[PDB]
């Protein structure tokens, strides 16, 4: 019974990987935070986002996403001092736009999660590499997906951020040969 291999120390990797990662999510609420939390990954590491992810919900959840879309510029300036999360003002203002553009699209009752991963032609992708290194961090859907979010007005959508969201959701099935029971390795 073996799974992954780059995971080591910092139980956040396994704890988060076991909690999700590899499990395609269609919930706009859960998926909406996935792309938003990773957005801060720029320069930071996915592991660091998990720690701030909990701190982010501590201050943001208190205001409820509704206020985040109709909050005030003085609100973000207040968190810059007391918050416990990455402070940059610009990064915070970006989250506000996400809540505004997110509600605008949902206002029509259109599902946000179904659109982001549907770009795969309603046909999830799978991989058959021996290690994660062989897996590419830039897949055809990642480049096309990032371009779609750009239209919504979302920033920090580089192909690297989209790839991280792809692995977090589960669109691509990552499983090194011999992972618990990876098939396809037959003669």
From Swiss-Prot:
Gene Ontology annotations of biological process type: base-excision repair; DNA alkylation repair
Source taxon at top rank: Bacteria
Enzymatic reactions: Hydrolysis of alkylated DNA, releasing 3-methyladenine
EC number: 3.2.2.20
Keywords noted in UniProt: DNA damage, DNA repair, Hydrolase, Metal-binding, Zinc
A single GO molecular function term of this UniProt record: metal ion binding
Activity regulation description: Activity is controlled by product inhibition.
UniProt-annotated binding residues for Zn(2+): 4, 17, 175, 179
A Pfam entry, by short name: Adenine_glyco
NCBIfam families: PRK10353.1, tag
Function according to Swiss-Prot or TrEMBL: Hydrolysis of the deoxyribose N-glycosidic bond to excise 3-methyladenine from the damaged DNA polymer formed by alkylation lesions.
Protein name: DNA-3-methyladenine glycosylase 1
Lineage summary: Bacteria, Pseudomonadati, Pseudomonadota, Gammaproteobacteria, Enterobacterales
Gene that encodes the chain: tag
